Structure formats: structure tokens, C-alpha cells
């Protein structure tokens with residue numbers, strides 16, 4: 001009798017270990033994707049505007065998917081921080097897509113202590129910095 | 136009579152062995168998880184401040200989850216040693232999340248014998264070193 | 271008596287499981303081989319002929335092992351689709367081996383609607399495309 | 406009586422099988438180690454001498470741990486075949502360690518039929534070839 005019953009108990013234990021292992025593996029098999037992007041970007045800064053002109057990019061991406069951050073100044077548009085939003089890009093505009101041939105104008109404001117030589121900005125896509133004016 | 140009674144005793148013993156084995160296995164089936172993280176980090180050190188600028192990361196993580204340690208100097212903030220805490224990160228601040236585009240300034244103090252060339256620091260997340268200024 | 275007999279039955283069952291497992295593994299341990307090839311190839315297309323000139327290759331291979339496919343035109347030789355066959359390569363010919371210094375001429379025919387600008391072709395070896403005129 | 410006695414016999418058999426298995430495993434769990442080495446080496450050969458100049462190495466190793474073999478010629482030193490030995494390296498010599506900046510001169514002899522164009526040699530460390538003059 002007993003060697004067969006002991007075998008049935010060990011099969012029952014084996015299934016629970018396998019089910020446990022499957023939940024451990026689930027912590028590895030997610031959140032990996034191709035996030036690399038690369039663009040030819042040029043820029044000019046003034047007391048009122050930042051100009052951004054794109055010459056080429058690795059892929060064509062929406063101007064709403066790009067986040068812009070700034071230091072030494074402030075945006076004149078206050079709703080948020082996507083490139084499409086601060087640049088005033090309408091959905092019909094040519095500049096709705098970030099690719100070679102797209103140009104943007106961002107309006108900015110300086111305090112009494114701030115100066116043009118102190119201003120810099122960065123463009124971020126999928127958590128990677130794709131441009132930095134102070135490089 | 137006796138061969139059946141001996142069989143009943145062996146079943147009773149078998150259950151206690153199986154119950155014992157289950158408690159042995161419990162020492163293996165815990166504390167395994169995916170703790171790997173990887174970031175593009177750059178840094179500059181001065182007699183008053185450490186600057187830390189992040190360009191990309193493997194995942195988006197809270198600045199309170201990262202621990203910072205220092206040698207050759209001391210922090211001007213004394214409450215603890217999380218990155219959010221020593222850098223003075225408010226909960227509304229852009230720099231509340233550690234990702235590309237996040238920048239931090241940490242204020243520090245040197246003794247009469249300490250010098251800038253002697254200072255170094257490390258960032259630790261889930262018990263792994265993710266950055267070391269002296270690498 | 272019975273604990274020994276139960277043990278003999280469990281050995282008999284164990285052998286059949288092991289024999290079963292061996293037949294499962296046989297579905298993995300076949301059909302893996304090094305099929306990569308790479309060649310410097312140049313080509314010119316006309317209303318009557320395709321010219322193919324080889325400058326180098328990763329290995330020396332038989333012209334009968336290479337398959338050619340065409341669109342926008344048709345071959346003047348109708349027996350099949352190996353490179354040796356459609357190019358009229360005799361077994362004594364220098365061009366029997368695909369390597370640097372081997373040249374081939376393939377004769378072709380166009381319909382009333384087909385034109386030279388529409389023609390393209392590919393070379394295939396061991397199920398991989400090694401050249402494509404429209405790349 | 407008998408089901409308990411049969412159980413005691415099966416425990417005695419189980420221990421001998423486990424002890425047998427332990428001796429099988431001992432044939433796998435030995436003789437695995439990191440034996441890889443890699444060096445920038447340059448060499449020049451003449452009718453009387455081989456010159457060997459080292460520019461870099463993966464690790465710093467003793468010149469007595471390296472074995473040299475030769476064809477088309479013979480060594481003027483006859484005691485053995487370690488690099489330190491045939492090159493006449495004293496224990497105080499700079500060239501006692503194989504690293505960037507170490508240079509060696511090995512004296513050789515040719516027969517009436519042998520010629521400089523026929524000579525070649527190899528350096529061997531832990532059973533791997535680390536340099537071969539005829540590569």
C-alpha cells in the first residue's frame with residue numbers, strides 16, 4: 001500500500017511548485033521593447049522664442065509623444081509639456097509629425113534676473129533624452 | 136489481523152513525513168525577484184554641490200526608492216539617505232521620478248582636511264549598486 | 271510482502287515514463303545547421319539578358335545549389351530554376367562554382383506589356399535570400 | 406509484523422543507492438576553470454634569433470607558465486621548453502612576467518637544409534594556443 005500513496009502525495013506537491021515557478025517567471029517576461037530614437041535637430045534661442053528645425057529622424061513619430069523640459073526660462077503656454085502642446089500644433093498642421101522638414105516655434109518668457117545665455121532645453125521620447133541644447 | 140493494522144500505522148507515519156517535507160520546501164520558494172536596473176547617469180562635483188543628470192533608465196522608479204552613500208564629504212541635509220530626501224525633492228517636483236530628463240542637485244560640506252578630489256558617491260536600488268562616481 | 275511488490279510496480283512504470291520522455295526530446299534535437307552565406311554580387315539587366323558577376327563569397331558553393339526567381343519577365347530555358355540550369359552551365363565550365371571571378375549570363379523574354387524597368391530577380395541558397403536586384 | 410520489516414529493508418537499500426549516486430556525480434564536478442588568455446604579441450625571425458615583444462595581455466602571468474614550440478629550426482638551449490627557460494630569463498629580470506612592455510630574445514640553430522622562410526613557432530598557456538607566428 002504505502003509506496004503508491006507516498007507517490008500520489010509527491011505528484012500533488014510537484015504541481016504546486018511548478019505553479020509557483022510560473023509566477024516567478026512573470027516578473028522577467030515584460031517591459032522589454034525597442035525605445036531607441038535618433039534625430040538631426042538644430043536650434044536657435046532668443047529673448048522671446050526657441051526655434052527647432054528637424055533635418056532627419058530614425059522613425060516618424062507624433063509631436064504629442066515628445067516631452068520638452070526647460071531651464072533658465074518659462075513657457076508662455078501653461079497647459080502641459082508635450083512638444084505639440086507648447087508649440088501650438090493643430091492636428092491639421094504639417095508639423096504634427098516629427099521628421100525631416102518639420103519646424104517648430106516655442107514662445108517663452110524670462111524674469112528680471114534671467115538672461116538668454118542662461119536658457120537651455122531637452123527633448124525626451126519614451127524615457128530617453130533625444131536632444132539637449134546644452135550638449 | 137496484524138498485516139492490516141501494520142498497514143494503517145504506516146499510512147499515519149507517511150502523512151507526517153509529507154507534512155515535514157512541505158515545511159522544508161518553504162525555505163526555497165521565496166525571495167526571488169527581478170532586481171536588475173540600468174541607467175545612463177552623468178555627474179559633476181564641486182566644493183558645495185554634486186550635480187546628477189539622468190539620460191535614460193531601464194525602468195521608471197521613485198526617487199524615494201534610491202539610496203545614496205558618500206565618502207570624503209558630508210550631506211547638508213541630515214534626516215536620512217534616500218535620493219529624494221537629500222536632494223530636497225518635493226512630491227510635485229518633475230524630479231520625483233528617476234528617468235531620462237531628471238536632474239538633481241545635492242548640497243554638501245567638507246572639513247578642513249577634506250578636498251574635492253577626494254569625494255565620491257554611489258546610488259543603490261534594491262540592494263544593487265546602479266552607479267558609482269569612482270568607476 | 272506488499273511494500274516490495276509495490277516497489278517493483280513503480281520501477282516498471284518509471285521505465286515507460288523515461289522511454290516516453292526520450293521520444294519527446296527527439297522533436298528538438300534535429301534540423302539545426304549553419305545556413306548563412308554572403309556574397310559580393312553585381313548585375314545588369316537588358317531586354318534579352320541578365321548579367322551576374324560575383325566578386326567574393328563567404329564559401330565556395332555549387333551553381334546547382336542556388337535557386338533563381340524572377341518577376342516582370344520569363345526565362346528562355348524552361349527545364350527548372352537552378353542557377354546552373356537557366357544559365358546553361360556545363361559541368362566542365364569555370365562558372366560551375368559560385369565564388370569571386372565567376373560570371374553568368376541568363377537569357378530572358380518579355381511580353382508586349384512588360385518592360386526592362388519592371389524586371390527584378392533574387393538568388394536563394396538553403397532557404398535564405400542571398401541577393402535581390404530590387405534592394 | 407512483515408510490512409514493518411519490509412519497510413526497514415527498503416530504507417537500507419535506499420541509503421546504498423544514494424551513496425552510489427554521490428560517486429557518479431563526482432565525475433562531473435571537477436576540472437572546470439577559466440583558462441582564457443589574450444595578448445598583443447609581435448615577432449621577428451632571423452638566422453640566429455627570434456625576437457618577441459609584448460604590447461598588452463589579458464592578465465599578468467609568469468614566463469615559466471608559458472610553453473613554446475618550434476618547427477623548421479632548433480633551440481640553442483636544451484634543458485626544456487618553457488619561455489623563461491629557452492629565453493634565459495633570470496628570476497630578477499624585468500622579463501620574468503609576461504605583460505605589455507616585456508621583450509624576449511630566443512637563440513636558435515638551423516641545419517644545412519633549413520632556411521629562415523621555413524621557421525615558425527607557437528606559445529601555449531594552460532593548454533590553449535595564445536600566439537602562432539604562422540597565423
Ligand SMILES: *[C@@H]1O[C@H](CO)[C@H](O)[C@H](O[C@@H]2O[C@H](CO)[C@@H](O[C@@H]3O[C@H](CS(=O)(=O)O)[C@H](O)[C@H](O[C@H]4O[C@H](CO[C@H]5O[C@H](CO)[C@@H](O)[C@H](O)[C@@H]5O)[C@@H](O)[C@H](O[C@H]5O[C@H](CO)[C@@H](O)[C@H](O)[C@@H]5O)[C@@H]4O)[C@H]3O[C@@H]3O[C@H]([C@H](O)CO)[C@H](O)[C@H](O)[C@H]3O)[C@H](O)[C@H]2O)[C@H]1O
Pocket residue numbers: 086087088089090093094095103104105106107
Ligand atoms: C506648428 O505649426 C503651426 C501651424 O502652422 C504654427 O505655425 C506653429 O508655430 C506657431 O505659429 C503661431 C502663428 O504665427 C505663433 O503664434 C504667434 O506669435 C505671434 C508673434 S509674432 O512676432 O508676430 O510672430 C503673434 O502673437 C500671433 O498672434 C497674432 O494674434 C495676436 C492675438 O490675436 C488674436 O486675438 C484677437 C483678439 O484679441 C483676434 O482679433 C485675432 O484674430 C487673434 O485671434 C495678436 O495680438 C498679434 O498681434 C501682434 O502680436 C505680436 C505681439 O505678441 C507682435 O510681434 C506682432 O507683430 C503683432 O503686432 C498677432 O496678430 C501668435 O499666433 C497665435 O494667435 C492665437 C490666436 O488665438 C489666433 O489663433 C493666440 O491668441 C496667440 O496670439 C498666438 O498663439 C506661435 O508662437 C508658433 O508656435 C508651428 O510650431
Ligand SMILES: *[C@@H]1O[C@H](CO)[C@H](O)[C@H](O[C@@H]2O[C@H](CO)[C@@H](O[C@@H]3O[C@H](CS(=O)(=O)O)[C@H](O)[C@H](O[C@H]4O[C@H](CO[C@H]5O[C@H](CO)[C@@H](O)[C@H](O)[C@@H]5O)[C@@H](O)[C@H](O[C@H]5O[C@H](CO)[C@@H](O)[C@H](O)[C@@H]5O)[C@@H]4O)[C@H]3O[C@@H]3O[C@H]([C@H](O)CO)[C@H](O)[C@H](O)[C@H]3O)[C@H](O)[C@H]2O)[C@H]1O
Pocket residue numbers: 221222223224225228229230238239240241242
Ligand atoms: C529637484 O527639484 C526640486 C524642485 O524643483 C529642486 O530644484 C531640487 O534642487 C534643489 O533646488 C533648491 C532650490 O534652488 C536648492 O536649494 C538652494 O540652495 C541655494 C544656493 S544657490 O547658490 O543660490 O543655488 C539657496 O541657498 C536656496 O535658498 C535661498 O533661500 C535661503 C534661505 O531662505 C529661506 O529662509 C528665509 C528666512 O531666513 C526666507 O525668507 C526665504 O523665503 C527662504 O524660505 C537664502 O539664504 C538664500 O540666499 C542665498 O543663498 C546662497 C547661500 O546659501 C547664495 O549662494 C545665494 O546666492 C543667496 O544669496 C536663497 O535665497 C536653497 O533653496 C532652499 O531654500 C529652502 C527654503 O526653506 C525655501 O524653500 C531652505 O531653507 C534652503 O535654503 C534650501 O534648501 C537645493 O540645493 C537643490 O537640491 C531638485 O533636485
Ligand SMILES: *[C@@H]1O[C@H](CO)[C@H](O)[C@H](O[C@@H]2O[C@H](CO)[C@@H](O[C@@H]3O[C@H](CS(=O)(=O)O)[C@H](O)[C@H](O[C@H]4O[C@H](CO[C@H]5O[C@H](CO)[C@@H](O)[C@H](O)[C@@H]5O)[C@@H](O)[C@H](O[C@H]5O[C@H](CO)[C@@H](O)[C@H](O)[C@@H]5O)[C@@H]4O)[C@H]3O[C@@H]3O[C@H]([C@H](O)CO)[C@H](O)[C@H](O)[C@H]3O)[C@H](O)[C@H]2O)[C@H]1O
Pocket residue numbers: 356357358359360363364365373374375376377
Ligand atoms: C557559364 O559558362 C558557360 C560556358 O562557358 C556559358 O558561357 C554561360 O553563358 C552562356 O553562353 C552561351 C554561349 O555564348 C550563351 O548562349 C548563346 O546566345 C547567343 C546570342 S548572342 O547575342 O550571340 O550572345 C547565341 O544565340 C548562341 O548560339 C549560337 O547558336 C545558335 C543556335 O545554333 C545551334 O544550332 C545550330 C543548328 O540550328 C547549329 O548549327 C549550331 O552549331 C548550334 O549548335 C545560333 O542561332 C546563333 O546565331 C545567332 O544567335 C543570336 C540570336 O539568338 C545572334 O545575336 C548572334 O549574333 C548569332 O547571329 C549562335 O550561332 C547561344 O549559345 C547557345 O547555343 C546552343 C547550341 O546548342 C550550341 O551549344 C543553343 O542552341 C542556344 O543557341 C544557346 O543556348 C548563353 O546565353 C549564356 O548563358 C555562362 O553563364
Ligand SMILES: *[C@@H]1O[C@H](CO)[C@H](O)[C@H](O[C@@H]2O[C@H](CO)[C@@H](O[C@@H]3O[C@H](CS(=O)(=O)O)[C@H](O)[C@H](O[C@H]4O[C@H](CO[C@H]5O[C@H](CO)[C@@H](O)[C@H](O)[C@@H]5O)[C@@H](O)[C@H](O[C@H]5O[C@H](CO)[C@@H](O)[C@H](O)[C@@H]5O)[C@@H]4O)[C@H]3O[C@@H]3O[C@H]([C@H](O)CO)[C@H](O)[C@H](O)[C@H]3O)[C@H](O)[C@H]2O)[C@H]1O
Pocket residue numbers: 491492493494495498499500508509510511512
Ligand atoms: C630576458 O632578460 C634577460 C636579462 O635581461 C635577457 O636580456 C634575455 O635576453 C637574453 O640576453 C642574453 C644577454 O645578451 C643573450 O645572450 C647572448 O648572446 C650574445 C650574442 S650577441 O650577438 O652579442 O647578442 C652573446 O653570445 C652573449 O654572450 C657573451 O658571452 C659569450 C660567452 O662568454 C661567457 O663565457 C666566458 C668564458 O668562455 C666568460 O669569460 C664570459 O664572462 C661569459 O660568462 C661570449 O662568447 C660572447 O662573445 C661574442 O658572442 C657572440 C657570438 O656568440 C658575438 O656575436 C658577440 O659579438 C661576442 O663577440 C659574449 O661576450 C650571450 O649571453 C649569454 O652569456 C652567458 C654567459 O654564461 C654569461 O651569462 C652564456 O654563456 C651565453 O654566452 C649566453 O646565453 C640571450 O641570447 C638573450 O636571450 C631576455 O629575454
